[PDB]
C-alpha cells in the first residue's frame, strides 16, 4: 500500500534528494510539483495527490545541525517536496540522547503524516551506518517506529562503513546499530562503501567525487526495486508480497543487490542473465551459498526466450549455491520507463540472500574485539559514559552479532534443522 519515506544522515539525505529528483524526472512531474504537459502509471504510494494534481513526495527529512539541508533549500526541486517536513557530535550515544529528548515532536510529525495518508504500508529508511549524527538517532527512531507501529513494515536502505580506514570508535557504533537493525527492523537492504567505490573507480576514472556517482547508483537500484509498484504490472504489486519470498527466515533478512548494466549509456536476456550471475555485476561483496534468489527484468523481452533461458542456465549450473532445502530462483518482469533514453533497453536487478556478508560482519567483529582487547580505542566518550557506565550494551550487541554469525553458519550447512 502507501509507503512513507524517512531520510536521515548526510549521505541518506543526498540519496533521498537524488531519488526524488530521479522519480520526478521519471514520471511526468515538473520540478514545481505540476504534472508535465505530456502526461496510466501509479504515483499513489510515495506521492500525495494534491490540489493541482501536485504529486507531493511522501517524505520526512530528519536532521540535526543542518549543513547539506541548506543546499537542498536553494534548489528548483525545493518546491517539489517540503510541505514543511524538514526539522532542524558524531557519537552513537550522542545522537541517541538528542533523539531521546525530541522524540515527541518528531513522532507527532510522523503521526501527522500518518493521518495525512489514507492507507499505510511501510516506513522505508534512508540510513548511513556510523555516519556520525545518523548513528544512534537512527537506531533510536527505528526502535520507536517498531514500538508505535506493530502493524507496519520497516525497510532499511543503508551503506556499511568500510573504506579500509579513520575513526577508532565507529565499529562500536556500527555494532550497536547492527544490534538495533537485527531486532527492530523487518528487512534490511545492505550496501558496501568500498565495493561501490571500487566499481566507480572501475567503470570510470574517478577517485574523489564518488558521492555524486554513488547517489545515482543507489537511486537507480532503489527505483528499480520499486518499478513494478510504480509501473503497475500484476506480480507482487505490494511490498509485502515481494518481501515474503525474499526473507526465508526472520534471522536472515539482509538482501544482496546487483545491476545488470554497469553502464547503459541489443543483447538478449540469456546473455545478461549470465552476466548477472557473474559477480562483477554484483555490487555487494568454505563455500558461501545463496538461500533464495530473485531477479526482476525490465526491457524488450520475448516471452518464450525467458523460459528457454531458464532451461539453459539451469542446465549450465551457473548458480553456485547449495541450499539446505527446496529454495530456488524466482523470475519477475517490469516495464521499461518512458521519456528516458536507453541504449541496450534490457536492464535487470537481482535480490538474493547470500551468506558472504557474514564474513564482512566478521571483519567488524574481529576489529571491535581487537580494539576492545587493547582498550585504548573506546576513548572515554561522555555520552557513552552516562548512557552506560559499564558499557555492557556493547557486550550485548557482541552477543547478538555472535548469535547472528552462528545462525549464518548454521544456514550454510545442508540442514537448518540444527541451529547455531
Amino acid at each position: 500500500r502507501e509507503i512513507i519515506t524517512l531520510q536521515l544522515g548526510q549521505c541518506g539525505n543526498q540519496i533521498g534528494f537524488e531519488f526524488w529528483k530521479q522519480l520526478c524526472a521519471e514520471h511526468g512531474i515538473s520540478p514545481e510539483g505540476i504534472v508535465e504537459e505530456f502526461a496510466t502509471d501509479r504515483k499513489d504510494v510515495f506521492f500525495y495527490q494534491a490540489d493541482d494534481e501536485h504529486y507531493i513526495p511522501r517524505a520526512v527529512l530528519l536532521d540535526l545541525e543542518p549543513r547539506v539541508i541548506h543546499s537542498i533549500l536553494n534548489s528548483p526541486y525545493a518546491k517539489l517536496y517540503n510541505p514543511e517536513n524538514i526539522y532542524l557530535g558524531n557519537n552513537w550515544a550522542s545522537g541517541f540522547s538528542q533523539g531521546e529528548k525530541i522524540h515527541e515532536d518528531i513522532f507527532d510529525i510522523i503521526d501527522r503524516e500518518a493521518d495525512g495518508s489514507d492507507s499505510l504500508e511501510g516506513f522505508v529508511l534512508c540510513h548511513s551506518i556510523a555516519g556520525g549524527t545518523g548513528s544512534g538517532l537512527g537506531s533510536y527512531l527505528l526502535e520507536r517506529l517498531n514500538d508505535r507501529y506493530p502493524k507496519k513494515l520497516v525497510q532499511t536502505y543503508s551503506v556499511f562503513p568500510n573504506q579500509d580506514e579513520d575513526v577508532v570508535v565507529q565499529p562500536y557504533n556500527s555494532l550497536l546499530t547492527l544490534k538495533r537493525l537485527t531486532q527492530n527492523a523487518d528487512c534490511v537492504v545492505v550496501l558496501d562503501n568500498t565495493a561501490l567505490n571500487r566499481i566507480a573507480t572501475d567503470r570510470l576514472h574517478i577517485q574523489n567525487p564518488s558521492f555524486s556517482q554513488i547517489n545515482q547508483l543507489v537511486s537507480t537500484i532503489m527505483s528499480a526495486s520499486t518499478t513494478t509498484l510504480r509501473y503497475p504490472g500484476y506480480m507482487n504489486n505490494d511490498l509485502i508480497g515481494l518481501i515474503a519470498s525474499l526473507i526465508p527466515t526472520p534471522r536472515l533478512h539482509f538482501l544482496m543487490t546487483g545491476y545488470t548494466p554497469l553502464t547503459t549509456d541489443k543483447t538478449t536476456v540469456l546473455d545478461v542473465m549470465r552476466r548477472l550471475l557473474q559477480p562483477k555485476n554484483v555490487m555487494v561483496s568454505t563455500n558461501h551459498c545463496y538461500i533464495a534468489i530473485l531477479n526482476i527484468i525490465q526491457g524488450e523481452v520475448d516471452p518464450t526466450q525467458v523460459h528457454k533461458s531458464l532451461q539453459r542456465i539451469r542446465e549450465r549450473k551457473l548458480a553456485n549455491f547449495i541450499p539446505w532445502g527446496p529454495a530456488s530462483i524466482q523470475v519477475a518482469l517490469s516495464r521499461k520507463s518512458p521519456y528516458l533514453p536507453s541504449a541496450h533497453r534490457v536492464s535487470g536487478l537481482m535480490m538474493a540472500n547470500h551468506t558472504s556478508i557474514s564474513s564482512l560482519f566478521e571483519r567488524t567483529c574481529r576489529q571491535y574485539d581487537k580494539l576492545r582487547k587493547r582498550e585504548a580505542f573506546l576513548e572515554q566518550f561522555r555520552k557513552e559514559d552516562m548512557f552506560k557506565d559499564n558499557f555492557d550494551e556493547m557486550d550485548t550487541s557482541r552477543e547478538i552479532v555472535q548469535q547472528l554469525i552462528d545462525e549464518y553458519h548454521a544456514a550454510t550447512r545442508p540442514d537448518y534443522i540444527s541451529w547455531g
Binding site: 501509479r42 508480497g241 515474503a244 527466515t249 532445502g325 527446496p326 523470475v331 541451529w419
Partner: protein
C-alpha cells in the same frame, strides 16, 4: 481483447490484489446481495486507476450457485457482454471458458492470501526467541516458495507465451478461429484438461493442507509438524507424477523447470 484480458486473466494489478483480499474476509450468509459484491469490484477498480470504459460497463459479478456455507471449493463468475454485431465474433461459449479460468486464478490468489494471513498471525505472536518459533516459521517460508513456483508456472504460460501470439494471428471467419485457438490454448496450459487431470488432482491436496495450516494457530506444535510432513510427502510425489507424463508435452516442460530446479 486487451480489455477483457485485464479482468478475466487478471492483467490489471491492484484490481485482483484488491478484489481477492476483500472477498476472502467474508468467507456464506454474506455475499448474497448484489450491493456489496457489485460494489467491491468498483472498489477494486479505483485502487488501480482503471475504468470509465464501455468495458467497465457490462461487468457483471455473479455466482453460478448459492453457497452451502475445511472447504476449499467455491464458485464465482465474472461476465462481460457485447451487442449484436460483435456477438458473432465473441460468443457466450468463449466467455464461459474465460469465467472458468478466472475462478481458477482467483483460487490461486486465495493461497497467497492464506499464507499472508498466517504470516500476520505469526507477526502478532512474534519479544523472546525459542526453538518452536524458528521451526514454525520454516513451514510458512516452505509453503510460500511452493505457491510461488506454481504461480510462476501460471505467470509464464497463460500469461506470457500465449500472449505473444494472437497479436498478429488476426492478420471474418479467421478472427473467430484465432480467438477460439487462443482460448483453447489458455485452457490447455491451465492443466484443466483431462490428460493433465491427475496433476490437477494433486493440486487439491496442497490447497486443502495449506488451508488447514491456516486454521491451526505453542499450543499444538506437533499437529503442525505432522501436517508439514504430509505436505512434504505430497510435494515429493508430485515430482514423480509430472515426470511420468514426459514419456506420453511442451507446455508441461516448464512445470518440470519450476518444480525441479535444484534438490531432488
Amino acid at each position: 481483447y486487451e480489455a477483457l484480458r485485464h479482468f478475466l486473466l487478471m492483467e490489471d494489478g491492484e484490481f485482483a490484489q484488491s478484489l481477492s483480499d476483500l472477498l476472502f474476509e467474508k468467507l456464506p450468509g454474506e455475499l448474497l446481495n448484489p450491493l456489496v459484491l457489485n460494489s467491491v469490484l468498483s472498489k477494486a477498480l479505483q485502487c488501480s486507476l482503471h475504468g470509465d470504459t464501455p468495458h467497465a460497463s457490462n461487468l457483471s459479478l455473479a455466482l453460478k450457485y448459492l453457497p452451502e456455507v475445511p472447504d476449499v471449493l467455491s464458485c464465482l463468475e465474472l461476465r462481460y457482454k457485447v451487442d449484436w454485431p460483435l456477438n458473432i465474433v465473441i460468443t457466450e461459449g468463449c466467455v464461459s471458458k474465460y469465467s472458468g479460468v478466472f475462478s481458477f486464478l482467483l483460487q490461486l490468489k486465495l493461497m497467497m492470501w492464506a499464507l499472508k494471513d498466517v504470516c500476520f498471525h505469526l507477526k502478532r505472536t512474534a519479544m523472546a526467541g525459542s526453538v518452536q518459533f524458528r521451526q514454525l516459521q520454516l513451514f510458512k517460508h516452505e509453503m510460500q516458495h511452493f505457491v510461488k513456483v506454481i504461480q510462476g508456472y501460471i505467470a509464464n504460460q497463460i500469461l506470457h507465451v500465449t500472449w505473444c501470439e494472437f497479436r498478429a494471428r488476426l492478420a471474418l471467419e479467421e478472427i473467430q478461429r484465432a480467438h477460439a485457438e487462443y482460448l483453447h490454448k489458455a485452457v490447455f496450459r491451465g492443466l484443466l484438461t483431462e490428460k493433465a487431470a491427475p496433476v490437477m488432482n494433486v493440486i487439491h491436496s496442497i490447497f486443502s493442507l495449506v488451508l488447514k495450516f491456516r486454521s491451526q494457530l505453542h499450543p499444538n506444535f506437533a499437529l503442525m509438524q505432522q501436517s508439514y510432513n504430509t505436505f512434504k510427502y505430497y510435494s515429493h510425489f508430485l515430482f514423480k507424477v509430472v515426470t511420468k507424463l514426459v514419456n506420453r508435452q511442451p507446455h508441461l516442460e516448464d512445470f518440470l523447470l519450476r518444480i525441479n530446479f535444484n534438490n531432488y
